[PDB]
Design a protein around this ligand. Sequence first.
Ligand SMILES: Cc1cc2nc3c(=O)[nH]c(=O)nc-3n(C[C@H](O)[C@H](O)[C@H](O)COP(=O)(O)O)c2cc1C
Ligand SMILES: C[C@@H]1c2nc(C(N)=O)cc(-c3ccc(F)cc3F)c2CCN1Cc1ccnn1C
Length: 387
Amino acid sequence: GDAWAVGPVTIACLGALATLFVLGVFVRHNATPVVKASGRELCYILLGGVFLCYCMTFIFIAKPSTAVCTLRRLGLGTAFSVCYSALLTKTYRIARIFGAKALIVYGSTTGNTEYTAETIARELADAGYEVDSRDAASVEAGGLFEGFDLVLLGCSTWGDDSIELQDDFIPLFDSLEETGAQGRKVACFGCGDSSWEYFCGAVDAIEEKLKNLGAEIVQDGLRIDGDPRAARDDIVGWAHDVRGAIPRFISPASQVAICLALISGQLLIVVAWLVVEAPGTRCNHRDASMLGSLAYNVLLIALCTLYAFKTRKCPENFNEAKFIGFTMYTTCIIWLAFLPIFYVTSSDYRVQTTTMCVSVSLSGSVVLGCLFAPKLYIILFQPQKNV
Ligand SMILES: Cc1cc2nc3c(=O)[nH]c(=O)nc-3n(C[C@H](O)[C@H](O)[C@H](O)COP(=O)(O)O)c2cc1C
Ligand SMILES: C[C@@H]1c2nc(C(N)=O)cc(-c3ccc(F)cc3F)c2CCN1Cc1ccnn1C
């Protein structure tokens, strides 16, 4: 009769208990770095989603009613949508910040502008950028700026009659049209001497050509007078203002906005089909009412796995990106394995519903077991690491 529901209900109960435990430990330690650095708000939205996956079991084991059918269609897509929107936004946050790529191309004869470049690069990698420093002799003009979020061009001033660019930088300057400059966020730097009429004339020449090319000049170029080693405060100070180009911060309020929008998209699909195809009684629409709902979640997961794989090497918040990666790879394995299972068990409603319950629970279990279990281990057993 209802013995088929012992297995699913036991799982859902233990899973809801485990989710309330994980929430509790997180809230108890809400101000500690492990809980704050991870993009806190998103982690709460995720546990809510996971708790809902376990709650789905009760709604599927309960007797079909117009309300039960509404909630079955409403909840199944939404519960998963809450999980994967939280996971996508977390990955987007990592990608947007540690994603950003900077390129520094310097021109130096005595290595002063090279030192200034070496200081800026260290500061930017510390800021979160994936810096790529190169000398103007090594660089080839064609497609040199492509795929870089930020580009810094360093060069010294020469000439014994007028402004002259550093020798390695002249071939780059003359063929700057074929570099990818238009629309690119740029900044210039260089070393000169105030004993010369045109102090850092090279910086001026490069800034003006970039303006003409259609580049986004982020800041007034850095002009180092004399020894750059004595201007470290000026050079680091400038690199601090430069780094605030591709934003290195996403507000918790903005994180919940993106997440909430991605949930809203599924809710629009699931409500739109409840309006056209009214719920009723077994449940009236067990056909292709959840097809759109499924496509939306298949998109979210695929997107999330692609971003998670791209962000896998990021060490921030105790290698979180690695564990977000693992939860997504396991989700793909689950989803791709249960798809033929639902097809072959379509003849038996009890087996079909039991499988649905087990798999929805399993999907929720890999989020707890892969993302939260390593976080809970540091919180509860390694407190010295959480301070
Ligand atoms: C012949 C010569 C011409 C220079 N012309 C200028 C100039 O017009 N304006 C300027 O501000 N500095 C000028 N300088 C100063 C250099 O740019 C300065 O020595 C700089 O620190 C060298 O940096 P680098 O090692 O990166 O090439 C000139 C230096 C020399 C030796
Ligand atoms: C198409 C729908 C569905 N929709 C979503 C979805 N909306 O994201 C997820 C799953 C699902 C995927 C992976 C897993 F492991 C467990 C799961 F439940 C399923 C499973 C079968 N189901 C049948 C159906 C049609 C109409 N009513 N129902 C109840």
